[PDB]
Amino acid sequence: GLEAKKEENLADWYSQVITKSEMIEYHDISGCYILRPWAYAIWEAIKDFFDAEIKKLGVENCYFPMFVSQSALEKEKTHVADFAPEVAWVTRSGKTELAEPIAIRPTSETVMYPAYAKWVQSHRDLPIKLNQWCNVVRWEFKHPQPFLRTREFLWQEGHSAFATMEEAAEEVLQILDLYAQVYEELLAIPVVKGRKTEKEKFAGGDYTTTIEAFISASGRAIQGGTSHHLGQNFSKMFEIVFEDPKIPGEKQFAYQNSWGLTTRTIGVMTMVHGDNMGLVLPPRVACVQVVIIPCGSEEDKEALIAKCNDYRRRLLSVNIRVRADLRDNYSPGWKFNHWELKGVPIRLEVGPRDMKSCQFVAVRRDTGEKLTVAENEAETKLQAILEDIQVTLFTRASEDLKTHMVVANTMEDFQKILDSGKIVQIPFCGEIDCEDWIKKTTARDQDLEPGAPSMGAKSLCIPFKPLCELQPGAKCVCGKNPAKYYTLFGRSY
Amino acid sequence: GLEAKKEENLADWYSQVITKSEMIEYHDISGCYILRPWAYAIWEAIKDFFDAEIKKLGVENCYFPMFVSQSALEKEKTHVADFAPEVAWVTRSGKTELAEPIAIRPTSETVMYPAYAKWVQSHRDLPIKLNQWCNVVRWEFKHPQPFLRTREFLWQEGHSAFATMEEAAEEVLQILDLYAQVYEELLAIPVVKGRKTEKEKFAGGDYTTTIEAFISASGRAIQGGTSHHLGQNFSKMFEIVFEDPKIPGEKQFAYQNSWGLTTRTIGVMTMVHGDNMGLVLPPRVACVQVVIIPCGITNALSEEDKEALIAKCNDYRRRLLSVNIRVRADLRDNYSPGWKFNHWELKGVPIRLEVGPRDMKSCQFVAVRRDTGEKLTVAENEAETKLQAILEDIQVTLFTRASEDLKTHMVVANTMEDFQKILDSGKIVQIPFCGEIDCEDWIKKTTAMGAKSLCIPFKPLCELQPGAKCVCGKNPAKYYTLFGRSY
Numbered sequence: 001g002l003e004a005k006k007e008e009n010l011a012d013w014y015s016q017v018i019t020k021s022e023m024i025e026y027h028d029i030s031g032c033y034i035l036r037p038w039a040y041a042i043w044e045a046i047k048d049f050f051d052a053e054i055k056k057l058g059v060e061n062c063y064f065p066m067f068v069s070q071s072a073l074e075k076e077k078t079h080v081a082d083f084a085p086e087v088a089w090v091t092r093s094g095k096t097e098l099a100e101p102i103a104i105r106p107t108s109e110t111v112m113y114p115a116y117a118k119w120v121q122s123h124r125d126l127p128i129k130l131n132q133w134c135n136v137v138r139w140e141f142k143h144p145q146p147f148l149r150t151r152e153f154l155w156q157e158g159h160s161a162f163a164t165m166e167e168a169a170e171e172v173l174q175i176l177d178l179y180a181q182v183y184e185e186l187l188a189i190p191v192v193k194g195r196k197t198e199k200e201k202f203a204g205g206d207y208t209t210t211i212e213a214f215i216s217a218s219g220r221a222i223q224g225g226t227s228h229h230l231g232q233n234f235s236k237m238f239e240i241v242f243e244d245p246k247i248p249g250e251k252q253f254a255y256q257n258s259w260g261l262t263t264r265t266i267g268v269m270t271m272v273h274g275d276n277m278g279l280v281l282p283p284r285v286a287c288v289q290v291v292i293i294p295c296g297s298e299e300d301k302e303a304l305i306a307k308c309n310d311y312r313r314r315l316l317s318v319n320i321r322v323r324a325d326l327r328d329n330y331s332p333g334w335k336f337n338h339w340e341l342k343g344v345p346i347r348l349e350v351g352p353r354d355m356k357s358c359q360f361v362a363v364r365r366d367t368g369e370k371l372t373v374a375e376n377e378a379e380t381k382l383q384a385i386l387e388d389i390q391v392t393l394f395t396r397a398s399e400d401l402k403t404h405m406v407v408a409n410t411m412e413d414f415q416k417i418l419d420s421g422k423i424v425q426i427p428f429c430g431e432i433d434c435e436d437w438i439k440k441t442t443a444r445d446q447d448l449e450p451g452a453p454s455m456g457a458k459s460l461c462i463p464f465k466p467l468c469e470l471q472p473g474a475k476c477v478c479g480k481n482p483a484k485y486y487t488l489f490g491r492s493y
Numbered sequence: 494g495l496e497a498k499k500e501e502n503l504a505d506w507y508s509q510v511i512t513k514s515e516m517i518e519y520h521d522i523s524g525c526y527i528l529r530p531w532a533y534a535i536w537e538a539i540k541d542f543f544d545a546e547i548k549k550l551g552v553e554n555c556y557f558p559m560f561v562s563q564s565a566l567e568k569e570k571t572h573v574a575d576f577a578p579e580v581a582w583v584t585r586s587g588k589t590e591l592a593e594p595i596a597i598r599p600t601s602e603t604v605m606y607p608a609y610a611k612w613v614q615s616h617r618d619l620p621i622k623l624n625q626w627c628n629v630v631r632w633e634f635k636h637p638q639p640f641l642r643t644r645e646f647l648w649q650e651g652h653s654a655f656a657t658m659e660e661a662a663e664e665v666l667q668i669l670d671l672y673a674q675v676y677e678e679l680l681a682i683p684v685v686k687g688r689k690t691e692k693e694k695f696a697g698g699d700y701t702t703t704i705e706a707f708i709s710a711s712g713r714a715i716q717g718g719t720s721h722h723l724g725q726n727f728s729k730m731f732e733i734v735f736e737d738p739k740i741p742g743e744k745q746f747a748y749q750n751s752w753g754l755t756t757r758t759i760g761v762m763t764m765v766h767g768d769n770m771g772l773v774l775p776p777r778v779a780c781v782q783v784v785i786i787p788c789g790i791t792n793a794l795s796e797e798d799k800e801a802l803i804a805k806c807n808d809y810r811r812r813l814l815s816v817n818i819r820v821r822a823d824l825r826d827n828y829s830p831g832w833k834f835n836h837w838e839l840k841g842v843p844i845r846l847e848v849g850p851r852d853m854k855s856c857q858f859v860a861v862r863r864d865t866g867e868k869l870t871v872a873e874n875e876a877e878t879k880l881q882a883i884l885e886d887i888q889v890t891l892f893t894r895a896s897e898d899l900k901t902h903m904v905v906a907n908t909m910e911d912f913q914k915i916l917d918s919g920k921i922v923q924i925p926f927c928g929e930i931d932c933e934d935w936i937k938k939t940t941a942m943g944a945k946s947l948c949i950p951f952k953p954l955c956e957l958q959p960g961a962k963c964v965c966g967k968n969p970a971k972y973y974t975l976f977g978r979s980y
């Protein structure tokens with residue numbers, strides 16, 4: 001059984017849950033983790049939903065090399081200056097030096113965009129809308145944490161190039177909403193949509209959009225997905241130019257977006273919904289939504305496992321994902337425990353009394369509530385229960401966010417509420433340095449709550465729909481500049 | 494259209510087809526290639542079929558790290574010695590030199606098997622059947638060739654551990670059959686199942702089963718998929734051990750297999766079926782099976798007639814969708830009909846569906862088969878049926894053509910002179926073989942590019958007459974072995 005407790009040692013509870021649920025195995029190279037089938041299946045459920053959605057938008061899947069030349073890596077100065085200290089460099093094969101060191105992709109702008117420059121020669125050659133599912137490497141020497149901050153991670157990155165800013169601007173928001181659907185409709189996690197501040201925005205892009213999620217267990221917020229408008233900052237460096245019908249002789253730079261989402265998702269799903277029995281899966285991504293365990297003679301034993309398989313096939317035929325744990329090797333209760341740790345939404349108990357009274361027992365994982373269900377009603381009732389679990393999870397999580405995201409209009413209120421464990425929308429002047437000073441003084445003036453994290457606030461996002469509307473001539477919390485917008489600040493992952 | 498001929502310079506033809514069908518772009522780093530969506534789609538078709546099949550076998554997908562440590566990498570000494578000259582090494586991040594060089598996976602035995610040791614505590618913990626779709630790197634400095642021989646490629650690698658040799662041996666043949674089905678039912682390419690000679694087997698394994706394919710245009714064979722019985726060679730090194738259920742205290746080492754399939758498939762599909770018109774897609778993997786091109790839309794035609802025309806194309810598109818034919822309707826304004834014929838012929842779309850104004854007014858259409866070029870006029874009401882029939886018939890005939898190729902280019906020979914210029918005939922030869930490595934090196938050296946072993950076929954063309962001597966003459970033949978020139 002799981003014995004670590006979430007409300008105490010969050011990090012050890014995280015370790016124990018992600019290992020005992022068999023989602024994650026440790027590797028002998030720090031910051032790289034083994035994604036076992038139980039986690040990978042969640043990634044695939046995401047993969048399937050998102051791939052369908054971007055296909056409806058004209059995006060096509062492809063695969064670009066993992067290595068980058070130095071010369072191409074340094075064409076956009078802002079971008080490479082941001083990523084350079086964390087780029088893994090391959091320098092030899094065997095004992096033989098390469099001709100020239102090659103970089104492993106931290107992100108694939110500099111891999112893809114020379115190809116885009118090749119493929120664009122006329123207005124009719126745009127848009128280009130490419131996506132790939134691949135790994136990238138970002139070799140930070142800070143302490144890694146499974147799913148959340150790792151040095152190799154699986155992700156998808158989409159890269160689109162348009163002839164007009166309007167097309168591009170349209171796609172940035174479409175994609176961001178899709179990410180919000182991934183979080184809220186699949187992982188049952190509510191998120192805040194907004195723009196990044198100048199400080200936090202993607203180096204080399206015009207503006208970045210983001211969804212933020214709140215982990216109430218640590219009081220911290222984490223960026224769940226991101227979608228950037230790069231504008232013409234990359235096309236002018238890689239010469240992605242077309243020559244217009246309307247505009248003779250004048251080279252036109254493509255307008256570009258890139259957008260990304262990673263297995264960080266799974267980590268967030270653990271931190272929000274997980275409890276002290278283990279993992280809790282939302283039904284829409286759970287590898288197995290219903291697990292059938294036989295409970296409690298010889299003819300009776302064979303007929304019992306046949307009834308379990310009856311339920312298995314019945315559920316299979318209604319697109320409920322289902323496993324029959326029919327091993328002679330472990331108790332009923334050990335299976336209860338194993339599948340509770342793995343977070344299966346419904347446990348299906350079938351014992352001979354229930355088997356001959358034509359019924360069964362359904363145990364919900366989120367609440368623990370046990371129901372007796374008539375055999376006849378399985379396909380119906382379990383579907384309903386599955387549906388109700390998903391809603392329940394989302395509802396609980398949303399009630400958390402709403403109670404932890406409040407407004408403060410002065411620095412002192414912001415400080416007190418932020419040390420209270422919440423994330424705060426404050427009037428903000430926008431300037432990078434203001435954000436630095438915010439970070440510095442919220443760390444300096446922090447009144448430490450028991451077990452609370454000791455760090456400064458960062459900006460999370462500028463919400464599209466702020467809680468309040470910035471009253472006219474409001475100063476920023478810095479006092480000295482007029483506020484430009486309400487910004488969501490908090491302590492971050 | 495396309496200019497280079499396949500029968501002349503095969504390599505120039507090949508580069509032209511793979512770029513002009515928008516499958517492959519070149520990267521500024523030699524040996525790595527961009528799989529554009531036309532190619533990636535084929536890979537995803539192969540993925541869907543194989544993923545489903547190995548799911549049925551009990552294999553689950555995972556993802557293991559791309560980096561392996563120096564210590565773990567050399568634990569099985571044979572395998573590491575085979576791959577070391579071509580392992581890429583990461584030595585720094587930014588400017589800071591790493592404390593230890595870390596390696597990029599060339600294959601993943603030495604990433605996964607320490608975890609397998611962690612996960613096999615008891616006999617109940619077996620079998621372990623994991624597979625992953627990922628990229629690997631084999632930084633060889635020989636001349637690359639897209640799809641076939643590349644420094645980085647996508648593949649699947651399945652790694653499985655069992656408590657007995659019997660279920661391991663079972664799975665090896667099962668996976669080899671799946672690979673044969675990918676080649677023959679999906680890509681419409683016939684292959685030859687066999688075992689690698691002692692020389693050509695996976696280093697650190699006990700035996701390697703393989704499917705070999707034949708590119709007739711160069712006279713060369715190539716290994717299309719492989720499936721190894723690693724035996725106990727890796728479990729004795731990474732200590733993957735379980736206690737015998739019946740003998741208390743005695744530990745047993747797991748028996749393991751690994752099997753792999755790469756994007757080389759697409760390259761083979763290009764070499765066997767491609768022609769001087771361009772790429773040729775087997776309907777079963779074709780991203781697009783039918784393309785609907787409206788013709789006749791000159792400016793003289795009425796807006797009434799133009800909108801009726803494209804509406805009729807949309808009718809066809811939805812009706813083929815209604816029967817699970819993968820149809821694109823290319824209704825674009827800016828490109829000409831001839832430009833579209835060429836575009837989609839180069840990409841090798843199996844059927845082109847031309848609907849012009851007159852055709853519409855006679856409730857009929859023109860279907861053009863990519864492979865042979867026949868134009869069939871077809872009544873409107875029979876679309877869904879007839880198009881289905883043609884798609885089937887394309888796949889069949891592609892396979893049939895290739896198969897006859899194979900059967901004429903694979904012949905028996907019992908002596909090395911016949912072997913020698915049957916081989917310089919542009920063919921592959923089955924010869925009686927002693928199996929010894931000295932003699933394999935000898936056959937390579939004599940046959941000069943010299944000939945290499947390909948496989949010891951499950952089903953040889955002829956049975957060995959007893960006392961048959963190997964072609965060395967010095968020793969007696971152990972088995973008919975398929976030899977030839979190789980990719």
Ligand SMILES: COc1cncc(-c2cc(F)cc(CNC(=O)c3cc(N4CC[C@@](C#N)(C5CC5)C4=O)cc(C)n3)c2)c1
Binds near residue numbers: 031142143144224
């Ligand atoms: C504040 O500094 C840190 C503090 N503590 C630890 C680290 C750290 C430690 C490591 F050992 C390795 C790393 C490198 N990995 C990552 O930076 C990272 C970023 C993301 N990100 C970033 C935003 C994004 C979204 N949405 C973008 C789409 C991409 C998304 O998912 C996802 C993952 C799995 N990993 C960082 C860094």
Ligand SMILES: COc1cncc(-c2cc(F)cc(CNC(=O)c3cc(N4CC[C@@](C#N)(C5CC5)C4=O)cc(C)n3)c2)c1
Binds near residue numbers: 719
């Ligand atoms: C006589 O030798 C050579 C001749 N000419 C060129 C090279 C060479 C040149 C390079 F620039 C890079 C490389 C490295 N890549 C590969 O070796 C390779 C092997 C396979 N393989 C090997 C067998 C297999 C099957 N079926 C196994 C499943 C795995 C399968 O698909 C597939 C791919 C795409 N790449 C080799 C080597």
Ligand code: PRO
Binds near residue numbers: 109
């Ligand atoms: O790393 C990023 O944030 C962007 C989005 C995906 C690719 N590059």
Ligand code: PRO
Binds near residue numbers: 600649650651695753
């Ligand atoms: O590369 C090979 O040949 C084996 C089988 C696939 C993974 N490793």
Ligand SMILES: [Ca+2]
Binds near residue numbers: 082083086
């Ligand atoms: Ca950085």
Ligand SMILES: [Ca+2]
Binds near residue numbers: 447448449
């Ligand atoms: Ca206090």
Ligand SMILES: [Ca+2]
Binds near residue numbers: 431481
């Ligand atoms: Ca100022």
Ligand SMILES: [Ca+2]
Binds near residue numbers: 575576
């Ligand atoms: Ca070698």
Ligand SMILES: [Cl-]
Binds near residue numbers: 016
């Ligand atoms: Cl525990």
Ligand SMILES: [Cl-]
Binds near residue numbers: 097098
């Ligand atoms: Cl090199």
Ligand SMILES: [Cl-]
Binds near residue numbers: 193464465
């Ligand atoms: Cl919003």
Ligand SMILES: [Cl-]
Binds near residue numbers: 284386387
């Ligand atoms: Cl639901």
Ligand SMILES: [Cl-]
Binds near residue numbers: 396
């Ligand atoms: Cl809660």
Ligand SMILES: [Cl-]
Binds near residue numbers: 591592593
């Ligand atoms: Cl290091």
Ligand SMILES: [Zn+2]
Binds near residue numbers: 430476
């Ligand atoms: Zn300010």
Ligand SMILES: [Zn+2]
Binds near residue numbers: 926928963968
């Ligand atoms: Zn011999």
